[PDB]
Amino acid sequence: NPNKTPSENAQAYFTKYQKAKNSVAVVEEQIRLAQEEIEYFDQLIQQLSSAS
RNA sequence: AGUACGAGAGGACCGGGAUGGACGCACCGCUGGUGUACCAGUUGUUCUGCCAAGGGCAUCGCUGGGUAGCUAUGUGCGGAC
Numbered sequence: 516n517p518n519k520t521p522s523e524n525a526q527a528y529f530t531k532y533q534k535a536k537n538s539v540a541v542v543e544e545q546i547r548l549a550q551e552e553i554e555y556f557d558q559l560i561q562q563l564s565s566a567s
Numbered sequence: 568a569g570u571a572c573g574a575g576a577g578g579a580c581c582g583g584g585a586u587g588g589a590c591g592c593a594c595c596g597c598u599g600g601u602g603u604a605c606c607a608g609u610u611g612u613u614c615u616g617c618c619a620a621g622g623g624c625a626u627c628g629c630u631g632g633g634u635a636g637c638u639a640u641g642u643g644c645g646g647a648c
Contacts, residue, residue, distance in 0.1 A: 517574080518574060519574040519575085520574090
């Protein structure tokens with residue numbers, strides 16, 4: 516257990532936790548957007564790989 | 568006093584003790600400088616009739632030292648409480 520400033524280390528841990536829960540929101544949103552992009556790009560690969 | 572402070576690295580305020588730089592005031596007793604009526608060596612010519620010994624001139628002829636005085640680059644002291 517740190518450290519020179521004994522409360523700000525625990526407070527830094529608690530801040531990392533708040534950033535972590537905001538990350539739980541935003542990275543799930545980004546995963547949803549990324550699977551939508553991969554589905555659209557796989558479709559674009561299919562439509563480029565020949566047709567009409 | 569590696570004390571306070573500081574996670575570490577680092578690092579005191581205050582208070583004591585030495586040693587310096589620059590500047591200044593004195594003075595030679597040391598270290599040196601100079602010291603043209605001090606001592607010695609030595610070259611050329613002239614003179615004291617000659618040898619020897621000396622004198623004159625050649626930057627004090629030149630060279631090696633040097634008393635007193637004057638000196639700093641030398642020494643003592645000051646800006647302390």
